[PDB]
Ligand SMILES: C=C1/C(=C\C=C2/CCC[C@]3(C)[C@@H]([C@H](C)CCCC(C)(C)O)CC[C@@H]23)C[C@@H](O)C[C@@H]1O
């Protein structure tokens with residue numbers, strides 16, 4: 001068959017939303033506290049994540065149907081998915097060659113080791129990089145990548161969600177677009193869809209592990225004082 | 240006459256405390272979010288103030304008698320004086336020639352204008368620079384400068400103070416040392432002391448004005464999100 | 479309260 | 489609570 005106008009318009013909105021919230025040159029990274037190789041990398045990565053959350057929020061407000069949700073559900077969705085949306089969008093900077101996120105010269109190239117200096121362990125980093133590698137290999141089209149982020153963000157299976165019925169529906173309409181798109185516009189993408197949903201499950205586990213490690217980092221004021229207000233608000237338990 | 244051993248030991252402790260909490264090269268400033276010429280300078284100045292508070296705290300813990308106070312009174316004293324201790328120690332970087340705080344190349348030289356881009360008005364900056372100029376002209380000895388900071392920090396006239404009797408006494412012993420020192424070690428310093436106390440009063444007004452302007456900056460989340468946890472904690476009203 | 483998230487979500 | 493000030497004051 002072939003996509004519908006509404007389906008195609010949703011794709012247009014998401015692709016443009018992402019273009020408007022993701023710089024492939026990473027020129028803003030110089031405004032971040034410099035990276036440094038106890039948790040010497042925490043200041044830079046905190047600023048990177050904080051900047052990124054702001055971007056995820058901008059992209060979110062442009063997901064069709066999201067802004068109609070109550071402010072409470074928007075926040076519930078952002079708070080629980082932010083970390084996953086970030087791991088997803090970061091894949092654009094990940095490189096299978098050097099197994100790192102390359103965003104600049106020697107300074108903005110992030111290795112597993114560097115994240116270790118932000119207070120995280122292999123318990124998290126191993127699966128993360130493993131996830132980044134698997135996702136990169138799916139050679140997603142920008143359209144499928146942007147849909148995967150909108151779909152992940154509209155997971156009604158998040159703590160604190162209220163109108164989990166309307167959220168459920170919205171995620172479904174997006175899932176429909178992604179499925180149609182793959183079938184119609186992506187040759188050899190017969191299994192793709194199923195693989196992409198599997199990626200959402202890996203994100204849940206990564207999310208869980210990150211939350212544990214973040215909690216510890218969070219309870220130590222000497223470390224929490226290195227984070228930013230926004231990061232503290234989005235990853236905090238005060239709901 | 241001549242200073243006593245105890246009096247001289249207090250001077251030794253304060254001078255060394257200050258040396259251990261104030262770098263005249265300002266090499267740490269590169270770890271701060273870069274300055275930028277809506278409130279483009281706020282990120283850098285927030286980091287500068289946050290870094291400075293940490294330093295004021297280090298110096299404070301070394302003021303003789305301060306650490307014996309209850310944690311509650313230590314916090315009460317820090318929270319209400321921090322801003323003043325900062326304006327005082329900043330005089331070391333202020334220059335009458337260019338009417339600015341010079342801490343680095345073109346980047347770390349702060350003019351009234353730059354502070355304007357941090358959300359502050361002439362209502363504050365005018366008296367500040369005026370204060371910096373007057374204080375610089377007193378050509379204080381490092382010993383008198385360090386005493387003036389310890390004395391300002393131990394002002395029992397601060398909201399939230401409890402044991403205002405012991406604090407009162409401590410400030411008095413320091414005032415005694417400063418007075419003796421000026422008389423004994425500072426030629427032509429007959430009026431000095433009186434002038435230094437007058438400076439403490441100017442600081443109260445500067446403190447008040449800064450508090451007003453900070454409150455406004457503080458209530459706007461788009462701006463408060465640019466501050467740091469420590470700055471938010473020390474200048475916040477949650478006591 | 480989520481002061482920041484609220485403001486950013488416009 | 490002053491979590492940070494407390495910790496820094498040791
Ligand atoms: C951000 C983005 C980028 C990379 C993501 C990375 C590499 C460094 C370490 C990160 C930030 C992981 C860390 C486990 C998260 C640590 C955060 C904290 C210290 C608060 O717990 C998650 C995703 C990783 C760069 C660019 O792709 C934009 C994207 O948007």
Ligand SMILES: C=C1/C(=C\C=C2/CCC[C@]3(C)[C@@H]([C@H](C)CCCC(C)(C)O)CC[C@@H]23)C[C@@H](O)C[C@@H]1O
Pocket residue numbers: 281284285287288291325326328329330331332333340342349354357359449453456470
């Ligand atoms: C810090 C230090 C220095 C300068 C102080 C300045 C210059 C820039 C503007 C400041 C930081 C004034 C601002 C009114 C305060 C703004 C803070 C905020 C935005 C939170 O409301 C107060 C003192 C001024 C450099 C060095 O002397 C160390 C010292 O320790």
